[PDB]
Structures are given as C-alpha cells and as structure tokens.
Amino acid sequence: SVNYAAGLSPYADKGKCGLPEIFDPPEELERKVWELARLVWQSSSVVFHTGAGISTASGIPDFRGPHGVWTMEERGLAPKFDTTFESARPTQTHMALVQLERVGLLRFLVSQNVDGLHVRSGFPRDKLAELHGNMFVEECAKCKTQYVRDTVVGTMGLKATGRLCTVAKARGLRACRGELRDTILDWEDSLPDRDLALADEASRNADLSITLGTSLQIRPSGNLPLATKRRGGRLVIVNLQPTKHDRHADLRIHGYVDEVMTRLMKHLGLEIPAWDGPRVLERALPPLP
Amino acid sequence: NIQGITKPAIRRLARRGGVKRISGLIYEETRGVLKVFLENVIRDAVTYTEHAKRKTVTAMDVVYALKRQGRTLYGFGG
Amino acid sequence: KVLRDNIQGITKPAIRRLARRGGVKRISGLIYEETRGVLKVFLENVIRDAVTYTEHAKRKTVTAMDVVYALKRQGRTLYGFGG
Amino acid sequence: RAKAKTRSSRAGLQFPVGRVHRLLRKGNYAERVGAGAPVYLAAVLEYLTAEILELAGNAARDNKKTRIIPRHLQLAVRNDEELNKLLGRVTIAQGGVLPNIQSVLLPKKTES
Amino acid sequence: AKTRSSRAGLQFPVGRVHRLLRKGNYAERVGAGAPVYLAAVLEYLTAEILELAGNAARDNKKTRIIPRHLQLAVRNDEELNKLLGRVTIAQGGVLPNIQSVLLPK
Amino acid sequence: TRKESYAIYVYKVLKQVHPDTGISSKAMSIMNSFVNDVFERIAGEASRLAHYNKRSTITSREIQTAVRLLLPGELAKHAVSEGTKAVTKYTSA
Amino acid sequence: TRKESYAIYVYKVLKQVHPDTGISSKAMSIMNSFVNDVFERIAGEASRLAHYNKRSTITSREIQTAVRLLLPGELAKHAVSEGTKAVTKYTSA
Amino acid sequence: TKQTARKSTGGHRYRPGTVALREIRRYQKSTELLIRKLPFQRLVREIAQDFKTDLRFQSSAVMALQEASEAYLVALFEDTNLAAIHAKRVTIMPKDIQLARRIRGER
Amino acid sequence: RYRPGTVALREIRRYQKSTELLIRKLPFQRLVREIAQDFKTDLRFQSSAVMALQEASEAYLVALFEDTNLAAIHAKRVTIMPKDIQLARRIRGER
DNA sequence: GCACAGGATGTATATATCTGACACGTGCCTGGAGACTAGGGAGTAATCCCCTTGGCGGTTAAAACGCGGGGGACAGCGCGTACGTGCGTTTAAGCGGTGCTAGAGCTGTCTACGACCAATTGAGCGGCCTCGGCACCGGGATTCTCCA
DNA sequence: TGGAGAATCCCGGTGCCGAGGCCGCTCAATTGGTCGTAGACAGCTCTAGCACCGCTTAAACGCACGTACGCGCTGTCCCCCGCGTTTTAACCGCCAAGGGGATTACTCCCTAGTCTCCAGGCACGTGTCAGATATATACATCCTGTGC
C-alpha cells in the first residue's frame, strides 16, 4: 500500500481535498442501478474503467477522497495505511469483472489503478490496458517484453528493478539482457503505446462504457469515457465524488461500488468468483453462454 | 585553408557529442586537435602509399593507417 | 587453503604511499575502498589472462612469462622478467 | 571421384571452411595448420556475425524498416556491453553516436 | 671478415637476427639485406638508450646502470617516451615531479 | 579482376536468422570488414600461442584459447560452444 | 637447454659508448626484453607491409618502411640512416 | 498525440538553452557527416601537401579520413563535456579538452 | 609540530625519489592467490610471477593516481575524491 | 465565471509517384574436394631434481587506534558579460555537364636471388674463480618549518 | 625582520655478493654450389582522379539584445592530517618434502605437396521494390465567440 504521491514526484497540483462524500438515497440508487442494468444487459460493446476506488474496499487508500493519501499529505501530515499489495486481497468487484469477461458481456477493461489486482484476479492480460502501470510487471528495455512476477519489483519512475531479461534467441545466441524496468508513470511520462492504443480502440468501439472508482481528473484515463459517448454511446459515471465530467455524464451514482455492482449482478442473475493468490492468466478465456 | 572548418561545424559536432554550451575559445583548440589527428593519420597513409610505389593515396592506405594507430575503420573494405 | 577477503591486506598506509608516489598532497577518506576495488579489478583481468595462458600450456604453475604475456596482451608490456 | 561435398556442409556451418583453411595457410601464421583449425575459426566467425546481424535486425524492426544500414549496426553494437568491449576501438562508418544527454544538461520541470 | 656482422659495421648478431626472421613465421622468403638493416636499427636503439642511461648514472654518482637509470633515461627523453609509452620498467620507479599548485605559498 | 569477400555467406546467415530483412551495400561492407578484422585477430593470437609453447602448428585447441583470450563475457563462452559443436560434428563426419 | 639473450652485444655497445660503466643483471634483463620487443615490432610491421602489397619477401625496403612507421621523427630518421649505412657497407663488401 | 498525453492533471523567444537541447536531440539521431566535404577535402590536401607533392587522393580515401576524424572529434567532445560537468559547469572550455586529452594519453 | 600539509610534500618527494615496492609483498601475494583461486584451483605461482604482478599493479595504480590528481586539481580542489577516480577511469576507456 | 460550439493547430493514416539501389538469374572459370603418399611433430612413457610449498621462531617495522585542531569543501549570494537566439545579408558549397589524361591494373618475359644442401670451424654459453661498488654504519654540516 | 630543529646533504671505513674475466668446446654461423620462381622490368589500356564551368540555394557570416552562467568572496563545519602509544604481522633465516617442470627415446599418426576433376562463387545483366517526398483525410486538443 505504498503511496504513489511522493513516489510520483514532489510536484502535485491536485487542488482537490474538499470532497463531500455524497451518497444516494437507497431507493434512488436502486433505480439508477436498475436503469444501468437495463442499458448494459443489451449493450454489446461494454468496456469498463476501474480507478483507485475499487481497491479502497480492499484496504489500500484512495488518492483524492477525504482519506486520500494526497488529501492527507495536503492538510497536515497523517498518511494511514492498513494493507500491502502482497497481502492485498482482491475486492469482490475484480471477480465480478472477471466473470463478466468470462460471459463475454465485458468487451474490454481499461483500469488506471496500480495494485494490479485485476491482473492478480485472472483478468486476461490481452484485455486490460494498465495505462499507468502495474507493480507486479517489469518490462524489458530491449525486447519490450513483459514479466508478470509474484513479488513487487519495488521501483518507481521507470527505472531498473535489478533483473536482466531471460528470453532466449534461436541459433544458440546470447539471451536478450535488458534492465526489466518498472511500469508506473511519473508526472510528465508517456503511456504504454500498445495498451493505450488498445484502450482507445476499445473505448471508441464502446457504445456503453461505465467508469468506476475514478475521479477522472487524470490524463487520458479520465478522457476515455468522453470519447466513449462522442460519436454515440452512453456514459455511466459510478463514483462517490463529483467527477470532472459529471456535466457530460449520461448517468451518475452516489454509492459504494461494491454494493452497486452486487445489485447489478443480482438483477442480471450473475454471480462472482472468490479471489485467489497471484493466479495470473493471459489468453482471453472463451466466452460463456 | 584550416578555417574551412567553420564554427557551426564544430558546434554541430559538439551537439552530436552531447555538449549544451560551448565556450568561445573552444573552436581554436578543436581546430588544432583536428589538425594534429589528420597530420598523424595522413603521415601514416602517405608512408603506406610511398612504400607501395603509388602516386595515389588509396583508401585502403588510410584504412591501414587507422588500423595501425588503433582506430580500425569499418565499411571501407579490408 | 581457501583464502578470504585478503583485499583488506592493501592497507590505508600502503594506498597512501602509492598515491604519494603519484604527487597527491591530500587524500579523501572514501578513496581507499575505491582504490581497493580498482586494484582488484585490474588483478582479476591480469590473473584471468595468465591462467588462460598457463592452462593452455598444459602446465599447473603460473610462470612469470605467463604474466608478462598477459600484460603485453593488455597493452601493459612489462620489461624485466623476460620476453 | 565421388560427389564433392564441401567441408562446410559436413560441419554444418554457413561460412566457408576451405576458404578459411587457405587464408590460414597463405596468411603465414604457422609452418603448418591443423585439420580442425579452419572449422573452428569459421564457426566462431559465423557465430559472431550472426550475433551482430541478429541485433542489427532487431534494431531495424524496432525502427520500422526492412534494410539494415550502418546506423543499425552501430546501435546493435554500442548497446550490447560485450560487443562494445570487443569493438571498443572500431569506428563503424556512418553509424553516428548513441543518443546520450547528460542529466545535468536536461532542464528543470515543475514550472507554472 | 667471415661473419656477416663483422662485414657490416655492426656489433649485433646478424646471423641470429636472420635465423629469427626466417623461423619467426613472418614471410616465406627473407631478403639477404633485411638482417643487416634490422640488426643496425636494434644496435642504434640500444646505443641510444644505453647512452642516456649512462648519462643518468654519471649524474647520479653511480659507476653502473640500474633499472632506475633506464627508467629515467626513457621518460626524460620525449622521442623514446613516445616509442616506449606503453612500457613499464620493473624497479624503475616514477619520474620525480609535483603539481604547480600543491607547492607552499 | 577477381575480388574476394564474405558477402554471400553473411547474407546466408542473415536470411537464416532474420527471414525477411535486407542489408545495405555499405552495411554489407561493414560486416565483411568486421569479419576480416576478427579473423586476423584470432589468427594472430593463435599463432602467438603456438609459438609460445614451441609448437609449429595451429589446432582447434589454439583457436579455442585465442577465442577465450579475445572475446569477453558470455560472447566467449557461446563462441567456444559453437566452435566445439562445429568441430565435433565435422570430426564425426 | 642453453638460452639465448642479447647480453653480450649490449655489453659491447655499452663499452663502446660508455667505456667506464657497468650494468646490473636486472638492467641487462630489461635491455634484453626491450630489444626483443623492438625487434618483434619492426619485423611484424615489415611482415604486414609485405602482406598488404601481396609480396612474399621481407626485403630491406619492408624493414625500412616498418621502422619509419614505428619510430617517431628523429628516432626514425636516425634508425633508417643507420640501417641504410649498414646495408651499403655490407653489400659493398 | 491522438488521445495520448503524459502524466498530469490537465493544463516568441525560447529560453536560452532549449534550442540547444533540440539541436542535440536532432544531431544525435542522424548519421550524415557534420563537416562540409569540399573544405575538409581541401584541408586534407593541404595537410598531405607537406609530405609528398602531387599526391592524388581517392574519393573513398577522403571519405574514410572524414569519417575517422568526425568520430574522433565527437568522442573528444563527449569526454570534454563529461569533464566540464565534473568541474561543476555546463560550458566546455579549452581546459576541459586539454585535461581530457591528458588523461586519454595523447597529451 | 608541523602545520598540516607540509609533510605530505615530504612524503611525496621521498616516495617518488625511491624505487622499492610500496605494497607489502606477502599480503599482495595472498591477494593474488585468492584472486587466482577463482579461475583454476590449486595453481603454483613462481615467485617471479608474483613479483611481476606486483610491479604491474604498482605502476598501474601510480599512473591512475597521477591522472586522478590531475582531475581533482582541474576540479578546483586539492583533495582527491572517488569521483576523480571514476572520471579518470572513464576518460581512459576503462570500465 | 464555466460550458457549448465552431475555427485553427497539430497529429497519424491512406495514397500516389518516383528512383536508384537491391534481389534474382545466367554463363564462365579456377579454386576447392577426392584420392594418394612420405616423413617428421609431437604424443607418450620414463627419468631426474629445481623449485614451490610448508613450517617454525625471533626481532621489530610498519599498521592500528585514538585525539586534537585547522584547512578547505562546500554552500550560499551577488555582479558582470559571454553566449544563445534571432534576423537579414553573403557566399561559396552542391549538383550536373563535359573534357582530359595520370597512372592503376593487368599482362608477358626473363634473371637475379632466396631456399636448400654439403661440408667446415669458431664463438658464445656453462661452469670455473677473483676482485670491488656501494649498502651499511659512525659523525659533521646544512635547508625549509615553525614559531616569534 | 629574527631564532631553535627535524630532517637532509655530506665525509671516512670498509667487506660481501654480484659484476667481470678464463676457458673448453659443440652446436650454429659460414663458404661454396645448384635450381626453381618470385619478382624487376617493359607495354597497353582505359578507370577514374582532376579541372572547369553555371545555376541553386543551403548554409555561413555579421550584428543586437538579454539572461543564464561563470566567477569571486565569505562563512560554517567536518573531515582530514600529524603525532604518540599499542599491537599486529610482515620479514628473514633456516630447513624438508615432493610436486611438477625439463629432457630424453620410440613412434605413429597427421599434415605438406601433387594431381585430377568440376561445381561454387564471381561479373555482369536485368527487373523491381523499399524508401523519400508530396497530397489528401480523419480526429485529438487549443483559442475564441456565444449562451448559461
């Protein structure tokens, strides 16, 4: 649960700490999740966006909220943490999304969190776009290959993690040897080209994309659901805080992401798997009926 | 005829090297260093040519001069 | 028989003598570990080359000519031991 | 005479074995040259060239091109430490230099 | 006289030089004039270095020549130093010199 | 005139390792010069090694020792491995 | 077996140039190594010169060119002059 | 920049120092020789004049000389820049080049 | 007592005028044997071999320290620091 | 003031056109492969003894540790100006033509010369002894340090 | 400016291990002669180095202005340096064992040297495809006008 506030850079122009945690009335929230379910159950191209609110239930604090790491670092000095990425237990939402992908309803997923709990939950790596990155992944500096490890690499700013590449070329040549740099973007750093392109294509193709656990204040990550509804498509912004694009939001919720998703799956008749260790899987699992 | 190496040329060479600013007195020193290097390499090449009883300074002669001075040069055959 | 961490044998006064030979008037404290590492690297190179020569010659003793040949290879020709 | 199967095919190399044998003999390297020296030398040269070419092709593919050029060889060389050591004294023509900018030279961001 | 070295105005062994050239695996044939030249050049270089070393010895109140004298002779002469840049003379020491700023002021 | 070069063999290796990729003329010249230089270095070291041990011939052993002396790092290990495999296959034939 | 060294002729030169000076065994070994190294340099450069032009004989011309390529200006001039004088006095008689 | 941006929150004369950085980035990604061929060829002719008169130079010979000299000067300037950085500076001065050569062994 | 720095020049002059082997012989031999243990086991160095190794190492270190002192003095200093050794080893192509 | 909407800036994609270098094809020839023999380079085993390893013991030279002070390493701040950047004027580098001929490369012929060999002998090396240069030790006189 | 000292240059006595000379001789240098060919010399040609031109125009050159840097001064502090006592282990002197280097025969297998045959590799001819430049087109973001 190390914070990516001092790790990113001292420069932090958040300017957002007064965040009234608006909550919806139970009946209004029920109706809003009902209509969202009615839309999604028929919407074909569905791509989600998970922010640093899903893992708050896991135990790792969010960034902007009243308990946000940046918020506390701004007003006084009191960063409180409970859990660790290594011990980070997946939230029920990660398994919900895994099941949604399994049944094929969830066309794509573009998260911006950093704990990689989606990767650890078995979500096909070919379907995610860890735009900001993932601790449990170090990418080679020569062959641009990835290695989903089991223990955090332990570095920030796209720097060496102390391991050389171990991919063997043919013709008994020397194995490629690159730094296996880390994947977390510092302020003023470019995004992974492949992941960003896949996310853009998915979001554009998405006639209905719902963005969770994110304030969407951040670069591109919060802009994908703008282009999801531009050129058609409806946007569902499920978050507690007022998002930077509520005025453009085609839907809104004020409630717990876990609870709203649980109600959605209950209405759909859908169930949720129950976490695991680092049971990582890459190939897209076959769609289910 | 030495001044043919204009200040922009040395500036471009430095920019390739990695330099960010260039003191105004560098250019003369760089010209002198270039003259010394060319004098040595040309003397070796011309000796190689004169030995082979040739009036022309073949490219391979310059390549062998460089190889002798521990600056083996590729791409010119040899 | 298995010698260990003998690099410490290069003591502070010895490195200070070596530097004084070079014309140094003052020596920072951190210089000593750095110099020990540099000498270790140089010796690793020379001993690797000498052992290569010796093992090629089917011998089991590192004759002085082995070290002289290694130094000549590394562009550090040494006079006073043959060759 | 039976079918003339060249030494390289038997050895399995791609470089010429007989050519290197003749180069060694006429190169004035020893009063006589072993029967296995050419094979070993050819194999070593083929492996070294294979390494350089493979790395250069990697650089080309990473540069969106299909014709290896001296720049690709320069990049394939200077970026691999062993080859840079082995080719320390060479100056591959038309190779340029690696894109190195010292950190102290870079500007200081976090303005505004 | 009988010996090649004697017929030339040399003191080095011409026969040994020729034998080493022939057996040294340098070329298939070795000119009959090459050994004279190579021996003459070796003799000249030995004469130069020994002259400088002896001068150093005499300036050092020593009746002989010791590796230190050879080191001083080699390093104190620019041409020989350039010829002998990448050599180290065991027991030769280092040419005495100090920086221009570390001296007392 | 009859000029000698390793161009054909270098191209064969390239098409063996990179099924679809060309190589410029200047690049081919650079590769050929590299092969020539490495050949000269290894041969010279093998000759000096044969002379030191008062042997009058060059063999796989001397070439192996020259490769060990010259190439650094994993380069030497893998080059020795390839040379040994080549010579053992050839001798078996 | 008996070994070969340039000690005797180094002694001859030393007495010729410095008739009243000796030399320690270490200095003799240093001179022997230096003479071996200089001879090796000159002869190797001559062999390279011969190989470059496809010649097959290391004639006095090869040696002269090698000594001009190796030694610096004044040293090279004096060495080449002494070599030419030696060859002239030899072939003449 | 199609939907791509660096990590952030959202939202004439160049400051002396940025145009030089752009120049560095430009010339360290190219490969063409960075000296005018005709003046350099005249320089090579003048230098070789002092050794042997009426000496004809192959075009490839002059090109090889130019490549060698360009590589040598680029390396020398890299080392000079390193020395200047070592001396707590950004502008390379003659003393930096002299020290770089002195350590290199050429001086 | 002597003001600091004055005997540094005295030691410089003394240790430059002399020609002995500065490092102690036995520790250097032990270091060399420990190093050689890495490559091949149970070697047998001729005393001349270790003498040559020590001579080479001493000459190399003396030259390196002269270069390092030049670097430090160029840096407007009188005390040689590790950064000076790194610079000298870098400008000479080592490492 | 923020947001909706349009104009503009800037980017990546599809496309077209062109050009000279690059891939494939062919005949031509000579350098490489197969079969062969002869002899000497260097395996291999035996033997000898030089030198490396190892140990011990005493004196004792240099390393180790501590302690104080003072020198300079390093940071900060302030002032001058030298270099970076920009612009407009110059100039000579680049390119493409021709037109010329020095001499680079190939060939042809022949002889001077290096390899080789046999037979001769002499001089440079291993072991022999003799003599002294300078390391070592005693003291007498001298030069920057430091202090005053 | 002056005065006391640690360290240094220098004079006299001298004896051992290393320089220097002696000498037998045994393998290597020397003389003379034979034979093949590698290179000296001469020719022919036609590749390509050289010289010159006119037009484009990319780059070089001169100046102007400002700020970012170099430089110097001043003030901690802290980090070496110098000295004195402890102590730690090198240094030397000698002795023993035995490995492993060095030399010696017997020999046998491998490489030099030949000759014959011929497919692999070259020079040239040809087709065309990758790469360079220019055009148009679709979508993100920035600047500005209008409406909330």
Ligand SMILES: *C1O[C@@H]2[C@H](O)[C@@H](COP(=O)(O)OP(=O)(O)OC[C@H]3O[C@@H](n4cnc5c(N)ncnc54)[C@H](O)[C@@H]3O)O[C@@H]2S1
């Ligand atoms: C570099 O990487 C970081 C990462 O990519 C994100 C982290 O923040 P975002 O995910 O962009 O926004 P976030 O602060 O998470 O906004 C979501 C809001 O949701 C609140 N929240 C907490 N727990 C929630 C549940 N269970 N349901 C709904 N909302 C919930 C958060 O407190 C926050 O207000 O960008 C940076 S930059």
Ligand SMILES: [Zn+2]
């Ligand atoms: Zn890799």
